[PDB]
């Protein structure tokens with residue numbers, strides 16, 4: 001598409017390639033062009049176009065779709081990862097953590113209410129604008145990072161919307177620590193490091209018929225030992241996100257009404 005001129009590679013992998021490009025027809029503004037090499041794909045881009053009609057402030061704008069598939073998004077200069085690496089001591093200000101978490105949960109509630117599950121939420125696809133706005137990116141299309149993966153994904157049992165609320169809890173903790181809460185090197189090591197903190201759940205909370213039984217893995221530790229800067233209300237919301245059983249985990253909609261945000 002000669003309407004765009006690629007100037008830098010943002011990333012490459014399974015998702016094809018994402019480039020930073022000049023939108024030659026729209027005043028030369030920067031855009032992120034995702035080049036991705038059917039019915040599943042056709043339906044997925046139709047869902048992305050539908051979400052864009054709402055123009056939610058907490059998800060990246062989808063400017064164009066070309067067809068061999070190219071998605072054109074607004075460009076955001078930085079991700080949450082870079083924002084956390086550059087924030088000076090003593091860290092992210094308490095009210096900035098609160099604001100970014102509120103916006104993250106609004107973008108996620110928007111996706112969950114239109115039955116889209118992100119499934120790969122991490123600082124790398126949580127974008128931070130020059131005005132401090134949070135914009136979700138890299139969703140809707142089907143070292144590594146299991147650090148934000150929910151226990152039910154690691155166990156290979158369920159994949160519903162609560163999967164993103166576990167990721168939100170990991171990210172919430174990381175905004176205080178400025179280092180990942182659960183840094184595992186494999187699916188089983190990730191689950192062990194999770195249970196080292198939250199403790200073994202009740203036998204009835206363990207999913208039936210999975211390869212890994214409860215027996216393969218522990219007592220709950222005070223979460224403030226790992227997130228020292230967190231307040232009482234923040235702690236209550238953090239634990240509601242880091243609940244082992246997905247049916248008992250708080251939703252993004254209820255999280256938005258938690259006393260922490262009042």
Ligand SMILES: Cc1nc2c(F)cc(-c3nc(N[C@@H]4CCN(S(C)(=O)=O)C[C@H]4O)ncc3F)cc2n1C(C)C
Nearest residue numbers: 011032034060073074075076078079082124125137138
């Ligand atoms: C896999 C994937 N799919 C993506 C996608 F569809 C869109 C974008 C995207 N990226 C950006 N910008 C990037 C943000 C990160 N930074 S940083 C902090 O300097 O490293 C580079 C920057 O060019 N803006 C909007 C997007 F939609 C980024 C995407 N990614 C990765 C690079 C996070």
